[PDB]
């Protein structure tokens, strides 16, 4: 239900709307970020609500070939969201869906070092007969990453659930992994480290039993 | 105005989903209210929509299985929707909708229509539909680099989300970072949230992180220590 849209940092953006009016139409043009309240960034084809920026402009229904078009001057990292366009006209009637939402991907932004953290089981933790260490990065774009776990020299192949980089808090990615094992495991191995692979850059944090 | 969202967070499957609408800042019987809805791997979906003489109406696509009502006592919508199933889960928002009327013609032919736009928002509730029962969730301290240390608690073991984190209520916001939560093998979800205190601050600070899990109604104050 998502149509990419990579644009580049600082220019325009012009997101056509998948529907075609038929006739006299009423376009709706909303924002929604994940995990936050959709805003209206747009009711009518040429009206703007109070706060919302003007770099947000519609096209309206002066004849009937212009398509409805919700131009984005001067993109930011911040406008990257799902953009729904909420058609009505006299030919279609009452239009339930939001239709197709285009997703916006800013393109052009600096490259941040991934800031890794490295937690060991806990004390609470082992004495309930489990042990898992907590890999968190965060600060790092884009979202490709590579986490791996090598207990000393011997690498870890079970045991290992990363999350998605879906946090985006301050634009930048983030993720969480863990690695599950028995105190037994935990005080066998000397040391367990956390390998993250970013833009292919290697960064590694160790913990160790003490 | 300002809209909240309130849930039970999990509903078996052939039961009857149930979700408030608590508003503030205006009155609520001179608006026209909605519900809307969004599945994972699915968009916005408008669920319906009442009037301000409390005559509803509903998408054709729930199958008449939504009722929505409004209570004037306490300010509040609320949302029924009965025989859920595995689809049903989704983020529930309600919001505020406006009608325009849009013509162009004679008012007299019929030469117009009325459309409706939401302008107002809420952050939503989540609502899963399982047959599994809720579990409270395990919380465990992260005791504590450059004049600073990471200081966090670990939260396992809990189904299904909302779940709250918080730091010293509203005294600490200052490198208070959570982590998205993961989804193991077993079902079960855990996430993790630090913060990053100077190195000066601790054995003379206090930090205690509160958890809080609504559908499994715990409530748990952890402490780290170092
Ligand atoms: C035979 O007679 C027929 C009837 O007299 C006539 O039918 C007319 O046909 C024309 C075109 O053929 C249509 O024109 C279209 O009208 C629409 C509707 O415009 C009206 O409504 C909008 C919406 O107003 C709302 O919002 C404003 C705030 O913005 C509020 O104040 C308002 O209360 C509403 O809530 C409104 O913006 C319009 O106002 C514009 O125009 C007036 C003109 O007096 C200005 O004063 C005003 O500042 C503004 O510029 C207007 O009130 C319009 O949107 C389209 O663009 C299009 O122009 C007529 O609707 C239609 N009916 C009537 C009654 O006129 C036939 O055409 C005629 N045939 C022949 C051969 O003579
Ligand atoms: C009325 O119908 C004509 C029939 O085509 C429309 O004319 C076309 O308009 C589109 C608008 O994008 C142009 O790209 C085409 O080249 C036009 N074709 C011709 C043959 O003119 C017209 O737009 C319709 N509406 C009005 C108001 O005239």
């Known amino acids: 239900y998502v149509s990419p849209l990579s644009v580049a940092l600082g220019e325009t953006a012009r997101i056509s709307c998948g529907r075609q009016a038929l006739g006299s139409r009423a376009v709706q043009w909303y924002q929604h970020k994940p995990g936050q309240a959709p805003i209206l960034l747009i009711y009518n084809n040429q009206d703007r609500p109070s706060g919302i920026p003007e770099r947000f402009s519609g096209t309206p229904d002066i004849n009937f070939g212009t398509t409805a078009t919700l131009t984005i001057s001067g993109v930011e990292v911040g406008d990257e969201a799902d953009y729904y366009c909420h058609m009505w006209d006299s030919r279609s009637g009452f239009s339930w869906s939001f239709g197709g939402a285009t997703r916006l991907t800013v393109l052009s932004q600096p490259k941040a070092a991934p800031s890794v953290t490295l937690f060991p089981p806990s004390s609470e933790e082992l004495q309930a007969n489990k042990a898992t260490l907590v890999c968190l990065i965060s600060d790092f774009y884009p979202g490709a990453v590579t986490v791996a776990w090598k207990a000393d020299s011997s690498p870890v192949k079970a045991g290992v659930e990363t999350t998605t980089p879906s946090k985006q808090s301050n634009n930048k990615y983030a993720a969480s992994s863990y690695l599950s094992l028995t105190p037994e495991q935990w005080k066998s191995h000397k040391s367990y480290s956390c390998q993250v692979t970013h833009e292919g850059s290697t960064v590694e944090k160790t913990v160790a039993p003490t | 105005v300002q809209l909240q969202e309130s849930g039970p967070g999990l509903v078996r499957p052939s039961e009857t989903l149930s979700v408030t609408c608590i508003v503030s800042?205006?009155?609520?019987?001179?608006?026209?209210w909605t519900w809307i809805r969004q599945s994972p791997g699915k968009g916005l979906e408008w669920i319906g929509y009442?009037?301000?003489?409390?005559?509803?109406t509903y998408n054709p696509s729930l199958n008449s299985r939504a009722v929505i009502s409004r209570d004037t006592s306490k300010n509040q919508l609320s949302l029924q929707l009965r025989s859920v199933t595995t689809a049903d889960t989704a983020i529930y928002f309600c919001?505020?909708?406006?009608?325009?009327?849009?013509?162009?013609?004679?008012?007299?032919?019929?030469?117009?229509?009325?459309?409706?736009?939401?302008?107002?928002w809420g952050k939503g509730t989540a609502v899963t539909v399982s047959s599994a029962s809720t579990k409270g969730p395990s919380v465990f301290p992260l005791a504590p680099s450059g004049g600073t240390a990471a200081l966090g608690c670990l939260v396992k073991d809990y189904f299904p989300e909302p779940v709250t984190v918080s730091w010293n209520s509203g005294a600490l916001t200052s490198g208070v970072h959570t982590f998205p939560a993961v989804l193991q093998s077993s079902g079960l979800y855990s996430l993790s949230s630090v913060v990053t205190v100077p190195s000066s601050s601790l054995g003379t600070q206090t930090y205690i992180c509160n958890v809080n899990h609504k559908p499994s109604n715990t409530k748990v104050d952890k402490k780290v220590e170092p």
């Open positions: 919001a505020t909708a406006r009608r325009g009327q849009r013509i162009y013609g004679v008012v007299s032919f019929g030469e117009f229509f009325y459309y409706y736009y939401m302008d107002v």
């Open positions: 800042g205006g009155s609520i019987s001179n608006y026209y």
């Open positions: 009442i009037s301000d003489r409390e005559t509803t």
